Amino acid sequence: SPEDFVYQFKGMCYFTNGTERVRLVSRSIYNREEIVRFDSDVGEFRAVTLLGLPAAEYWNSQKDILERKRAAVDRVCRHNYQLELRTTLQRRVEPTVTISPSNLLVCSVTDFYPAQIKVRWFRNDQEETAGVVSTPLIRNGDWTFQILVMLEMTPQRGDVYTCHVEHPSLQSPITVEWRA
Amino acid sequence: DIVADHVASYGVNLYQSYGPSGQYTHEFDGDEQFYVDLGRKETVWCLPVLRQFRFDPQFALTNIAVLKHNLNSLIKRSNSTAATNEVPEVTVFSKSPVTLGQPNILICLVDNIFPPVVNITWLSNGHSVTEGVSETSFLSKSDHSFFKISYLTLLPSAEESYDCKVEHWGLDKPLLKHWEPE
Amino acid sequence: PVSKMRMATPLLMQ
């Protein structure tokens, strides 16, 4: 097999409570091993392994380099966030809900954004919890998610099963019924 | 490992000796906002709404140049310590619940990719499929491996099946993940 | 007046 050498540099922003707490961590990676890092919490570069030692020592010795990395959390993170607030964080795509048999009843909740979602089963107006198991939240890669929420049942006469779904995109919760 | 409401990569900058090749992309909450076409000096947005914004593709090329230099310094300094081949992790599922004759999309998820070199192709009943096929860039993970997602468009039909075909150095023989409608 | 997405920039080693 062929040989390969990989270098990664990641400028990551971390946001919490809107824009109250913002943290920048620039990361340098040599083949899956982070070697140098700038973390706005710290305020200067820090080697993270020996390989990253000369790099951090040199970069830290430059008053103008640190000057600019300390400003980065404002120049890059807070700036982009404003654009995110007007677009990406506004994306609301509504779930489409479907019931189907696999003794199992699967409630498919597909194509939504963002990720927050609550799916509850009912049997005849009573909530079912003990007999429910979800798949993990599945990321489609296309800026939507999906999730499958299964329910164990044995169908009796006059039984109505209800999938109940809550999502930021919906003013009112979606309900889909299914009959024996 | 850091806990936040939202996490961005306003720079996933990648360079590798093999090829050689590069990649430049922005991610937000785990999805690709855009990548830059380095051979074309062109910004390609991956979420429609974001086409209203600008981003100069030139500077992505510049960034890759820096990386290219640094990689050379570290190959020298690490006594030529080369990347380790992982075994990729494959899954195939559909975007929507399956209805015969109703348009769907097959998703091929390829996880734990390292190094970022892989061939992902599709097979219908043993033949290969060319059209309806697209894929994401390499997306980053916190453990510094990548994942990549391949898509195929189709009308599901009974007795018509698909294989998602993955080739990686961490793989002894190419891997095939099967999908039946059922 | 078109708004711009910014990026963090990498550093050259010595």
Side-chain angles (χ1 to χ4, degrees), chain A residues 1-20 22-124 127-180, chain B residues 1-53 55-75 77-158 160-172 174-182, chain C:
Chain A
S1 56
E3 66 160 25
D4 199 11
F5 298 92
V6 174
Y7 190 104
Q8 321 185 32
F9 166 77
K10 295 171 176 199
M12 305 195 66
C13 298
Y14 294 94
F15 303 93
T16 305
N17 276 350
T19 188
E20 280 180 341
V22 185
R23 156 133 88 125
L24 178 71
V25 174
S26 303
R27 306 188 192 264
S28 311
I29 332 286
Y30 175 83
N31 293 346
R32 296 233 284 150
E33 173 185 320
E34 194 184 356
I35 59 155
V36 204
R37 150 198 315 171
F38 180 97
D39 169 7
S40 73
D41 270 16
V42 191
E44 63 176 31
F45 294 95
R46 288 293 168 85
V48 163
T49 72
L50 295 183
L51 273 187
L53 217 32
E57 291 178 283
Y58 171 63
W59 296 337
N60 273 323
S61 70
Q62 310 290 75
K63 238 224 307 179
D64 55 331
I65 287 185
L66 293 190
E67 169 227 9
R68 268 180 166 55
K69 285 280 174 140
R70 281 163 195 178
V73 63
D74 298 75
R75 180 185 64 92
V76 180
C77 299
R78 279 198 183 78
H79 175 77
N80 286 17
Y81 195 78
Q82 295 316 119
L83 311 194
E84 303 293 11
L85 266 184
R86 275 161 38 200
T87 62
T88 286
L89 297 164
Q90 287 275 90
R91 176 172 177 85
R92 307 266 184 274
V93 173
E94 305 197 358
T96 108
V97 195
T98 273
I99 307 187
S100 170
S102 46
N103 229 320
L104 219 42
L105 224 59
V106 185
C107 178
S108 298
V109 191
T110 71
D111 291 340
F112 57 102
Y113 191 94
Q116 176 190 167
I117 202 153
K118 185 50 184 168
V119 175
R120 306 200 287 251
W121 270 111
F122 286 84
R123 179 180 85 220
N124 298 328
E127 173 158 357
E128 276 253 31
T129 44
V132 184
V133 48
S134 302
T135 70
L137 177 91
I138 302 168
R139 182 185 292 268
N140 289 322
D142 60 3
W143 294 81
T144 68
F145 296 95
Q146 66 169 292
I147 197 177
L148 266 54
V149 189
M150 299 153 285
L151 170 66
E152 165 79 21
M153 42 71 87
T154 71
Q156 308 299 345
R157 289 282 300 270
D159 259 353
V160 190
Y161 295 100
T162 284
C163 189
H164 188 282
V165 170
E166 302 173 18
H167 191 277
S169 62
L170 307 170
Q171 298 196 353
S172 17
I174 289 181
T175 59
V176 169
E177 295 187 357
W178 184 90
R179 282 178 174 69
Chain B
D1 285 339
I2 297 96
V3 159
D5 288 347
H6 305 285
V7 181
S9 280
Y10 293 140
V12 186
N13 291 242
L14 158 64
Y15 184 88
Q16 59 188 326
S17 77
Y18 181 79
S21 44
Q23 184 181 276
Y24 185 91
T25 58
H26 286 198
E27 303 180 353
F28 189 95
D29 279 337
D31 295 311
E32 190 178 356
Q33 287 185 319
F34 70 84
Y35 71 90
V36 178
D37 191 311
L38 310 163
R40 277 177 241 258
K41 308 202 266 182
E42 187 178 308
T43 299
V44 187
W45 303 90
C46 282
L47 185 76
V49 63
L50 300 182
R51 296 193 184 105
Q52 63 178 107
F53 301 130
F55 179 85
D56 198 337
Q58 186 52 253
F59 294 137
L61 285 140
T62 282
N63 281 26
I64 309 307
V66 180
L67 295 174
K68 181 227 194 84
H69 183 284
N70 292 5
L71 179 64
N72 285 324
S73 302
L74 301 196
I75 297 169
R77 170 154 56 249
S78 95
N79 210 339
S80 283
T81 307
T84 301
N85 300 328
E86 292 287 304
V87 305
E89 204 192 18
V90 192
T91 300
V92 284
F93 53 98
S94 74
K95 181 163 148 72
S96 323
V98 158
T99 304
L100 301 180
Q102 211 68 29
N104 216 334
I105 296 169
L106 288 214
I107 315 275
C108 190
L109 177 57
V110 181
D111 217 340
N112 193 35
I113 301 174
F114 208 90
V117 176
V118 63
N119 288 335
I120 309 174
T121 182
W122 292 89
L123 300 183
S124 179
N125 297 282
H127 266 38
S128 62
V129 180
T130 294
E131 59 173 325
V133 182
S134 62
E135 62 188 34
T136 74
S137 297
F138 286 106
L139 291 312
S140 69
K141 314 233 283 181
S142 65
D143 64 25
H144 314 305
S145 51
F146 301 85
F147 69 91
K148 175 172 271 242
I149 295 174
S150 196
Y151 306 96
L152 172 57
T153 55
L154 85 167
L155 268 61
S157 177
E160 180 195 90
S161 62
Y162 295 76
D163 278 289
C164 179
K165 170 146 161 268
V166 164
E167 290 188 291
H168 193 70
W169 292 330
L171 290 179
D172 50 338
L175 185 46
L176 303 188
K177 271 282 173 169
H178 192 73
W179 181 93
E180 289 278 344
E182 80 196 273
Chain C
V2 186
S3 307
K4 38 158 146 54
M5 282 280 283
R6 298 180 184 169
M7 58 152 184
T9 207
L11 293 171
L12 243 196
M13 286 164 179
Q14 184 185 351

